[PDB]
């Protein structure tokens, strides 16, 4: 069947833009009908890696199951989460993507974190995350309590290291900083590992899925 995204882009839907949640749910579909110009997507500004590839790889899907890869209320004992940002508002209140978690310091510190997930499911798992690039050194210290930071993500088929680039960008949706979005398909039996000492927009919801109508 077809998957309808209403006023939303593939990015807004798959990241969980707060305005892209009333969507009629679907565990399978043959194509993605999306508007030539969706209004709701990356509510927090940034570059979305490999985006056309993701649209194509999600265009036809035989099984699609959301699951809490890193359970929000139980997986982050030493960090807090942002309560929300104005550019991602819902019902007149600051919010954020449903599928990511904006980790911030706790008790004036941001401890090193290391988090792994082994795909014991028997299908590919789509994992999505982001890296925050604050507009100035004062926001960097305010959230992450250190001037520089590292984010690392590694699987048997994905490996990349990220460094926040602190600089004032032109405002987009009122925001001078940026969040760049990344994703990978974790194969059955592989493990993905996240390591960071700051600037990680962590995965909260991931997706077990069967690409292909077959």
């Amino acid at each position, epitope marked *: 069947a077809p998957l309808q995204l209403g006023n939303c882009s593939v990015a807004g839907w798959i990241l969980g833009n707060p305005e892209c949640e009333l969507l009629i749910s679907r565990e399978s579909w043959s194509y993605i009908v999306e508007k030539p110009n969706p209004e709701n997507g990356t509510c927090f*500004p940034g570059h979305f890696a490999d985006y056309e590839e993701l649209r194509e790889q999600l265009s036809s899907v035989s099984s699609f199951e959301r699951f809490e890869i890193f359970p929000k209320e139980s997986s982050w004992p030493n960090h807090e989460a942002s309560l929300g940002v104005s550019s991602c508002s819902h019902n007149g209140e600051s919010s954020f993507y449903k599928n990511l978690l904006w980790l911030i310091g706790k008790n004036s510190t941001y401890p090193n974190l290391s988090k792994s997930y082994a795909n014991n499911k028997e299908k590919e798992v789509l994992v999505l995350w982001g890296v925050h690039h604050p507009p100035d050194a004062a926001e960097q210290t305010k959230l992450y309590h250190k001037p520089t930071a590292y984010v690392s993500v590694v699987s048997s088929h994905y490996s990349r290291k990220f460094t926040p680039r602190i600089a004032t960008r*032109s405002k987009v949706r009122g925001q001078s900083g940026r969040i760049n979005y990344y994703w990978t398909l974790l194969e059955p039996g592989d493990t993905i590992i996240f390591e960071a000492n700051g600037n990680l927009i962590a995965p909260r919801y991931a997706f077990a899925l069967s690409r292909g109508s077959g």
Partner: antibody
Amino acid sequence: QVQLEESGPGLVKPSETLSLTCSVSGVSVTSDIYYWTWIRQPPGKGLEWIGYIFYNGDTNYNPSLKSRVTMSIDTSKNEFSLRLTSVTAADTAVYFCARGTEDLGYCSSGSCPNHWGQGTLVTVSS
Amino acid sequence: DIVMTQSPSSLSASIGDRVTITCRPSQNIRSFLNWFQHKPGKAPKLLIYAASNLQSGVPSRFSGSGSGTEFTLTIRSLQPEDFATYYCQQSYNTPPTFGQGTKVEIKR
């Protein structure tokens, strides 16, 4: 914050070389995210892009200017510059320097100068 | 090469009036279009970024809209300080290009 200020020869003779210097204050030209730009406004006309340069040495220049265009960056003085050769009266203009910030989600590389200087007039005649 | 065509080239409007300046590029450019304000002898200022985004220090009367092959800068309650020449700029193809400009003057 960031201050950019252009300096140069107000008068240049034809067939000679135009040299122009942007003094940047508040930020380091050594950045890997910020890019540097020259733009010009011929008398009576609009805005013409000259080109960009990144500290990584990556540069791109307007095809219209053929190959008379050079930019460089002086880490020692925190400045960038422009050199234009075989100058004609058609190069008479106010010259603008500007900073931008790499932002591939909303701009092609080095293509969105967003903090400009006030400009400096360069007249080409004998 | 991407040719940027603005309309009108000049206009006169009363204080409090809503002004609309239009920009059409020679090809689709998505939202890779910015708007600048330029006053004689002053530094150009980026007012709108990526078609619709207000910049810091820019009053809420300024708005940008459109995508692809049609863009509009709107100034809703023209004020005397808005006297200037406005330019659209495409950031989609390597040679960045500007529209010819739209001069805004005050009707009295």
